[PDB]
Design a protein around this ligand. Structure first.
Ligand code: A1ANG
Ligand code: A1ANG
Ligand code: ZN
Length: 140
């Protein structure tokens, strides 16, 4: 689990979005595993605006932060988890690292702020849904 809180926005994995998230839907993309809902309380997170390929992610299944090198956001085929089947995901970044289902929502961060959230895993890789393209998260 886990979310990003920036202004009046909550960013979550689309597959973990709550009834409240969907009731206050701002934007969702099934291909990206992202949903943004509106919040009454102002969030304090900063979204990274950059093309860093290094950062640190929180891995709840190890209660540890790991430094990783990660690929630029791409269209990637993802093999069978349990929440999703096998299928294709856009704006996805991979690193070598530990990821289990419940690690989704772990934040990946660089010096510039939040890069993305854990979204996929398995075969010794971790996949992160990029948010750095969502410039609109930084206003109203
Ligand atoms: F009125 C409402 C409000 C939110 C949901 C959305 C949830 C999301 C998970 C799947 N069950 C539905 C439905 C109806
Ligand atoms: F998890 C992290 C990782 C790094 C920073 C800090 C910056 C500044 C020092 C070098 N670049 C990184 C913040 C949160
Ligand atoms: Zn950066």
């Amino acid at each position: 689990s886990g979310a990003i809180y920036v202004g009046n926005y909550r960013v979550v994995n689309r597959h973990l979005a709550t009834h409240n998230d969907w009731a206050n839907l701002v934007w969702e993309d099934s291909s990206r595993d992202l949903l943004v809902s509106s919040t009454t309380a102002q969030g304090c997170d900063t979204i990274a605006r950059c093309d860093c390929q290094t950062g640190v992610y929180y891995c709840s299944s190890r209660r540890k932060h790991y430094p990783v090198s990660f690929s630029k956001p791409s269209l990637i085929f993802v093999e069978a988890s349990e929440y999703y089947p096998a299928r294709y995901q856009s704006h996805l970044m991979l690193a070598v690292g530990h990821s289990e289902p419940g690690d989704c929502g772990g934040i990946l961060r660089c010096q510039h702020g939040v890069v993305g959230i854990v979204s996929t895993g398995g075969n010794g890789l971790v996949g992160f849904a990029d948010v750095r393209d969502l410039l609109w998260l930084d206003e109203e």
